[PDB]
Amino acid sequence: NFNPSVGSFVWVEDPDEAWIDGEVVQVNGDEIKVLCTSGKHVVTKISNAYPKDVEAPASGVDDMTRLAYLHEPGVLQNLHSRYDINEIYTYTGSILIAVNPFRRLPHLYSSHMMAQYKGASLGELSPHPFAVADAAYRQMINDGVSQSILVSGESGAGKTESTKLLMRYLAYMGGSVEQKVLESNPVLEAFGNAKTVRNNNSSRFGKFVEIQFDEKGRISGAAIRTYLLERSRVCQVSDPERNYHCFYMLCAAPQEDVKKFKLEEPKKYHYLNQSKCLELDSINDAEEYHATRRAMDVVGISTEEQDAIFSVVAAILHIGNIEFAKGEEIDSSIPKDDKSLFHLKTAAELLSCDEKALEDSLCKRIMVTRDETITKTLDPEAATLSRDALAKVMYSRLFDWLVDKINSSIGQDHDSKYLIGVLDIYGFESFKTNSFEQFCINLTNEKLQQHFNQHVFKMEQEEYKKEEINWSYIEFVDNQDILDLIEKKPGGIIALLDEACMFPRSTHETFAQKLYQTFKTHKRFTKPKLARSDFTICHYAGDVTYQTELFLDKNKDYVIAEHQALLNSSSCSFVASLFPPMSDDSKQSKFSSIGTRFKQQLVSLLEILNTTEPHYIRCIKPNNLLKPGIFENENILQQLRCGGVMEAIRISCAGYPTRKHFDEFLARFGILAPEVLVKNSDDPAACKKLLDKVGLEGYQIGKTKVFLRAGQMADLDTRRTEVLGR
Ligand SMILES: Nc1ncnc2c1ncn2[C@@H]1O[C@H](COP(=O)(O)OP(=O)(O)O)[C@@H](O)[C@H]1O
Numbered sequence: 001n002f003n004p005s006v007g008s009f010v011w012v013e014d015p016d017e018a019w020i021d022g023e024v025v026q027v028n029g030d031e032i033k034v035l036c037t038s039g040k041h042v043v044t045k046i047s048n049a050y051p052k053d054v055e056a057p058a059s060g061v062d063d064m065t066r067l068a069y070l071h072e073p074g075v076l077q078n079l080h081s082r083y084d085i086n087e088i089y090t091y092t093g094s095i096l097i098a099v100n101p102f103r104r105l106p107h108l109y110s111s112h113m114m115a116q117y118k119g120a121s122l123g124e125l126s127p128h129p130f131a132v133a134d135a136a137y138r139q140m141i142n143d144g145v146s147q148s149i150l151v152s153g154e155s156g157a158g159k160t161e162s163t164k165l166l167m168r169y170l171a172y173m174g175g176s177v178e179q180k181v182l183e184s185n186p187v188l189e190a191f192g193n194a195k196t197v198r199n200n201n202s203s204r205f206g207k208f209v210e211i212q213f214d215e216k217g218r219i220s221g222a223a224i225r226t227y228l229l230e231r232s233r234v235c236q237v238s239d240p241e242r243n244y245h246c247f248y249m250l251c252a253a254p255q256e257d258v259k260k261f262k263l264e265e266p267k268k269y270h271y272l273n274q275s276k277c278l279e280l281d282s283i284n285d286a287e288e289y290h291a292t293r294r295a296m297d298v299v300g301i302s303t304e305e306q307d308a309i310f311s312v313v314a315a316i317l318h319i320g321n322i323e324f325a326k327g328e329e330i331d332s333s334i335p336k337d338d339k340s341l342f343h344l345k346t347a348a349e350l351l352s353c354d355e356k357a358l359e360d361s362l363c364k365r366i367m368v369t370r371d372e373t374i375t376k377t378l379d380p381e382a383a384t385l386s387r388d389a390l391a392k393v394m395y396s397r398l399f400d401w402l403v404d405k406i407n408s409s410i411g412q413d414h415d416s417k418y419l420i421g422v423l424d425i426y427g428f429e430s431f432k433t434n435s436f437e438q439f440c441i442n443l444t445n446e447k448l449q450q451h452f453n454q455h456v457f458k459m460e461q462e463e464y465k466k467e468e469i470n471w472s473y474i475e476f477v478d479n480q481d482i483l484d485l486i487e488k489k490p491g492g493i494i495a496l497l498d499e500a501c502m503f504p505r506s507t508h509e510t511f512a513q514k515l516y517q518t519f520k521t522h523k524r525f526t527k528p529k530l531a532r533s534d535f536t537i538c539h540y541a542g543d544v545t546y547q548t549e550l551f552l553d554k555n556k557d558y559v560i561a562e563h564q565a566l567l568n569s570s571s572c573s574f575v576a577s578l579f580p581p582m583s584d585d586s587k588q589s590k591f592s593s594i595g596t597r598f599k600q601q602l603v604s605l606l607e608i609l610n611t612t613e614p615h616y617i618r619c620i621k622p623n624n625l626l627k628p629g630i631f632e633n634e635n636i637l638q639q640l641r642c643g644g645v646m647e648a649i650r651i652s653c654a655g656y657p658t659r660k661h662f663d664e665f666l667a668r669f670g671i672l673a674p675e676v677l678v679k680n681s682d683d684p685a686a687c688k689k690l691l692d693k694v695g696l697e698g699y700q701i702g703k704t705k706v707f708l709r710a711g712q713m714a715d716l717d718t719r720r721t722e723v724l725g726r
């Protein structure tokens, strides 16, 4: 076991900074007194203490499994040391660990650096996402099976940056399709990314990039898949956060390019004024407009199609400045001041429709009756809800048109045999107020971590028990019950939300009370005492309390009748093309459920990833100030524990990554030792004896399969290739 010396350096617990560095000064029977470099003297039992590796280089260890002292402080200190010398990447078994640098490293990601990793093995070079990308490319041809790379972490930990690296390297192995997949990121980030408290350039939509490869290995096609874009940001923004980049790009654009839009300072427009943050130090909005147009030309978006897109973006900004006051008649709406009539006229001119038809779209809805057509009027509060509804649907139809035009140039089938898919989702985020959009984001992260848990801890250890192997079970925290809490078919938070959405005039307190009487006897569900309509979920990353105030509203997906009627009446080809013409030999739907639609998309994505061989990259956010050179133990310790990094190191150190059937084993490696006899095609004793003849040790013989350590299968294929070639 462990026995501390009278004078030695050990790790001890501390209220802050997690573990602290100390030196024992006194030794009792079972307790010891440590002395930290800080000077404080702590007293604790020996079992709480952990030995410290004094002989540790600043470079640390490239693999956490090769660490001399496997425990939490050594993992934390190995990470910290490599972070100080700008070595952000580090391996854990086959998994890659990435700590956010929060600074530019041009040499670490140059195209020359790609050539260095072109033929490199996973462990030959220093850890890098290019090595994970190459591993996915090599394992695709050696197996003929599709691959997928899965990037995880909390919000702002570097998933989107990590995905850009994988795409730049994957385009290098198959190489005009390559250029357009790389230029699709700036276009989508202009309309799907915005500043939050967690990330200055936070992804508000999840993407799944699919790279197609033919049998020869060329990049035949590529496709991008986007999931639940947040459109509520268009209308309501918190003070720290910012609206989508496109709005600020257009206000910083050269005046001759946007002279027709009649744009003002950003602080004037209602959809941006709520934030009170209009500029970013890390983002130059003027350059982003020039970069986005440049990227749009690469994808093939016509310059005339670019003008109509920005006309919609500038129109949405004008629409937000249309205030409503009480009309002369009861429950009537009218523009408040003459400035709202300016914006109402401008937004109609930018949308190529009638100014009065636009005004009648927000102030007055029409009731549907077979006997005659009647028009009611709206109160100012109802009219405000009608203009915010118009903007959201206009922005999502615009964002969806982009993803359709992107794949209309880079998406095609050349009868390819397999693909590689890198997955970029939104990270687990928690704010002082948590809406329905957060509920789906954290659900997505919850589902991805379960996939990690299954393919790393559940499926691996079931085989170990199945094969009668000598093995100590490694316990872990499973989040399956949280998934059953949300997407259970016979009553889940998603399923219950559709129930309350069917009943008209259902308040958020009724859906709230329904959650309490149903999930009362549950471990992962909690209710705040003073909050009637707020519910808390014990997420794997931490407790998050949600507000159901807007849950029923965010879930219903519908198109306002007079909204689609106006947008269809537009003289501009692009504006009318944003809404499909329904009701002509077509079915009319009351509303569609976003919760079930998003759940269905999440299951289909999971089923495609279950047919591919996965590769994991765990991103880590080192600090919350979004600045470099700040390594915080508490932030990183809580991410390692809830992410299961400690258990993964334990499974990678003692586990067996590769297993082959006896018949597959004697066929390939029986040629290594011709003198070793074999009784039949699947004889287990020959496997034991053929491995001893080669000199391998630590292997384990199972019920029906052999089990080898991380690098033991690799040298057997190299030994085989040498003898068969001779
Ligand atoms: N490899 C990297 N090189 C440079 N900056 C990085 C890198 N990874 C992350 N960052 C920084 O972290 C920020 C957030 O990263 P991002 O990919 O947006 O995380 P997430 O997708 O999880 O929100 C970036 O805007 C950038 O400043």
Ligand code: ALF
Binding pocket: 154, 155, 156, 157, 159, 160, 198, 199, 201, 202, 203, 204, 425, 426, 427, 428
């Ligand atoms: F932009 Al994120 F998690 F915050 F992908």
Ligand SMILES: [Mg+2]
Binding pocket: 159, 160, 202, 203, 425, 426
């Ligand atoms: Mg992102």
Ligand SMILES: [Mg+2]
Binding pocket: 229, 230, 231, 232, 437, 554
């Ligand atoms: Mg929404």
